[PDB]
Symmetry: D3
Subunit: 105 residues, 6 copies
């Protein structure tokens, strides 16, 4: 660790890393949903649990790893899921903190 | 419910902004990668669209901005001509070229 | 007209922010992808530049921030060494490496 | 025309984002000005709403977020209780409390 | 002028000043329009020529100084205007660059 | 639950960006309002802090950036002098003035 790491230019960047990562994921989600707009699926694309849930058809389950941005805070290997039903998307259950073992003391 | 969940409501309200920002970012990167050419008409952003740098007599034609795809009644394109006076106005105008309307 | 229209004028004023933000995003993503490895000099941001994680004895060299190209008199690269004491200061310094001044 | 002008179209599409960002900014400033108190339930942002720090037995009640005023069928409020286990879920739920719907 | 002014932390900020100023004006415009939503005026609030045009009634002319963010590029004292009509807002004419004498060589 | 919900978790991660951006915006506005006057030390941004325009012999002192309060061991202020050579370095240095470290 050096004077470089403690410089205020690096501190400003380091403090924004989680934010930049999440915004980047939100942007990709927006672009994805846009590229699929002509298809009209049963469950349109949504964002929750800081995760993009791509458009889906009835009976599909979308499963993804827990958000990578918080990898260092996870106490177990884990994933999150959402089901597309005839009445829309299910709740994301288990949700992020439960599925992922997120912890910050 | 999940559609009306507030995290999704936050995201959905931001989608146009995220999409436009990425398009502007790509435009800035395009103009930057090209800055050692010095063309008649340098790159501009107009009608929510990036217009690559160009020389006199060129016509640049691009598809209508995809961000408003749900409000178009047709797949359209928009153009500008580079002249020795600079860039022309976009033609046809955005609203007509793109078949744009809002209920 | 178009060149001087306010849509373009707002975009041109945002170019710096858009290009640096994209570079910060890339840096954040790079450091996230390399978090499993535990390198001697970790990823840092300094002089508006991402400096990738590195090992003792490496020198990382990158072009001057393209974002300020119009303010350069020279084709410049900047560098840091990863040493046993950590990251070196940037060399040559940003102003000299890049031939920067405001006009 | 002027409504459908692309500069206005850019702005209108950004209004929710600008409004939410200012509300988040005010929340961050509120939490920061209060950080030397150490209350049972520290400040949180939930349901697009800032929840001031609070002590056990308190109920914090605020109006529904004004950013979605055009989609409400009534002026509503939302609440949380601070307990010795932390913050409660918002009540009534956002959709019900606020009379929210989209055509 | 010192090493402070030439530091990359200051250069990053200085390069973003116009942007921050315009975004701030856009935010205030958004808040203004929101605070007026119950009123339903003939011409709803709009943004062009990097200017907020507040909600208005038929027959009103809104006039404002040229955007302050570009004060240093103006070659003459000037203002911009927009009229609210029974068929919506007029075009902003003269527009920014004409009204304001904007120049950048 | 709420404290650990992702809406709050995203907000908490954005706090730094929101607070610094608000401070940068205030700095931009301050410098714009003072542009008629032509001061000896012009407005600058350094060590995540706005340093207002100033005259020879002035010392500008401000509290350590509140944004990093949780990383301070001390109640700190930072200062610069405007001298005939321009702005001084910040004193005491940011790390020492503020009692900063990462935990």
């Amino acid at each position: 660790s050096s004077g470089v790491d403690l410089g205020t230019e690096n501190l400003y960047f380091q403090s924004m890393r989680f934010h930049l990562e999440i915004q980047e994921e939100e942007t990709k989600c927006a672009e994805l949903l846009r590229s699929q707009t002509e298809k009209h699926k049963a469950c349109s694309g949504v964002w929750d649990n800081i995760t993009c849930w791509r458009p889906a058809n009835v009976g599909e389950t979308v499963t993804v790893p827990c958000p990578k941005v918080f990898s260092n805070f996870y106490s177990k290997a884990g994933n999150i899921s959402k089901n597309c039903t005839s009445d829309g998307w299910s709740e994301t259950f288990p949700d992020f903190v439960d599925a992922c073992g997120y912890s910050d003391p």
